[PDB]
Amino acid sequence: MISFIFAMDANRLIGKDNDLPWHLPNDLAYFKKITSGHSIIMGRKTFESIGRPLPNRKNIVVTSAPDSEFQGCTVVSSLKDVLDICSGPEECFVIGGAQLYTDLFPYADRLYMTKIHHEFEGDRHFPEFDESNWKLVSSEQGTKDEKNPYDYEFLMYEKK
Template sequence: MISMISAHDLNRVIGKDGDMPWHLPDDLKYFQKITSGHSILMGRKTFESMNGPLKNRKNIVLTRDENWQHEGAVKVSDLEEGMKLLGEAGEGFVIGGGEIYKMALEKADRLYITLIHEEFEGDTYFPEYSKDQWKLTSRVKGEKNEKNPYDYEYLVYDRI
């Protein structure tokens, strides 16, 4: 099963200047819990924005740079190759960035969306997903507190 996981605001903003425009520690814990033990596919810029490969996951990096390599990451040069590796071991996750999400959306079976009920400035967006192609199967309200200062909810959509 191919899943996509992302947090976005009310306008589908996911990033600004190579980073997330918000800080939600509980969402990062949710991301870790959901993806741990699975394969994850990301673009090179997303990989390089992290502090190395994510632990307890097979890190698959899509890049056009033939010479790129990094210990702890598997390089793929096209989306098909990445999706094949993702699907080999049960559920695999596309984790960004914007261009990778856009290319992979039509191949995804499930969306894990953290919807942040705010509007942020950004330069990177999650692609539009039509409610007539996706069925909401889970909705859990996140806890707003001092460390997580926004209203947000965890949504799971399955392709119809």
């Protein structure tokens, strides 16, 4: 099973200069809660943006690099390998970046979208998709506080 998790702004922005466009600590805490217990699948630039493997998850990096360059991870060279690893009932989380979200979109079963109601500047976007193909299963407004000073919400869609 393939689930996506991502945070995007009102213009579908996810990144700028190989980095996040904002700081939203409660959303990162949510990401940790959701992805705990699961293999996480990421592109090489997303791994480097994170900087070190995330704890308590199998970190799978899609890259042409040798395995030796990402020893704290499991390297695969093709998304075919991702589908083989992820086939069946056990849930993989695809954690970006734009290239994986776009190319793996037809194979996603679930979308865990943090929607930030703001427009930032940047250079990487989540792919357009027709929301009419999806059911909104859950929605929760994110805490707006001093550390998390946006209007944001945690949405989960499941494919029809």
